[PDB]
Amino acid sequence: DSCIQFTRHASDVLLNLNRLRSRDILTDVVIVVSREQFRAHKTVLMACSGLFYSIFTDQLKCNLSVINLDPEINPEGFCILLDFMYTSRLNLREGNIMAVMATAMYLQMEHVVDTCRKFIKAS
Amino acid sequence: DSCIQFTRHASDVLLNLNRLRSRDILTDVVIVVSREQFRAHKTVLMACSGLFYSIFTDQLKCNLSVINLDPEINPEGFCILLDFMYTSRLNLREGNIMAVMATAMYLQMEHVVDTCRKFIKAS
């Protein structure tokens, strides 16, 4: 086509979606990880995770307001990944890298799994 | 912070949100423009437009499944802008620039209004 493109548009969209999350505006699901609860937008979860994409395209699960993750999933690892989904920023540290990689493999977030594997290989 | 960042994340998120729109997955509103109907995600509309942000933060309008725009709004201008919201790409042409600028001013999409003003000034 003969379209023009606004370079910062996608980043500005994601920044506003994170502002809505922080104010709990139009969140339509709660993700339960052990005792911890995380509110989010189904569409953003699907856009970032192969696991959520599969869950919310299912004709029955698409209507659930609560999703319980496998009890092996660490709430801190999930929190770091949910923050990444809404910001593009990953808080990867020596003390959390194993829990982050395991959570990203479960959530099917291929690019996060790739950077965790590379950072572990270096050490 | 000490975060790392994935450069293509925001663009990849927006690409997936557009894939959901094209398949009509989790769309929660219909925007009526004269005889024409456009299905979309309320959160994406809010993230891109000052007008939709105001509408869907309103305690009564946040629950509407149908929104009717002012009859002066041109369906083609709206279609071009909805495409921009989901892609960052604007199909700006000599034959549509006046309808696109008027629709962007109504929708309160400041960056689109700015490029339309510049393209009109040049001609």
Binding site: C3, I4, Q5, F6, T7 | R89, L90, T115
Partner: peptide, 4 residues
């Protein structure tokens, strides 16, 4: 704005 750019030519993509």
């Amino acid at each position: 704005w750019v030519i993509p």
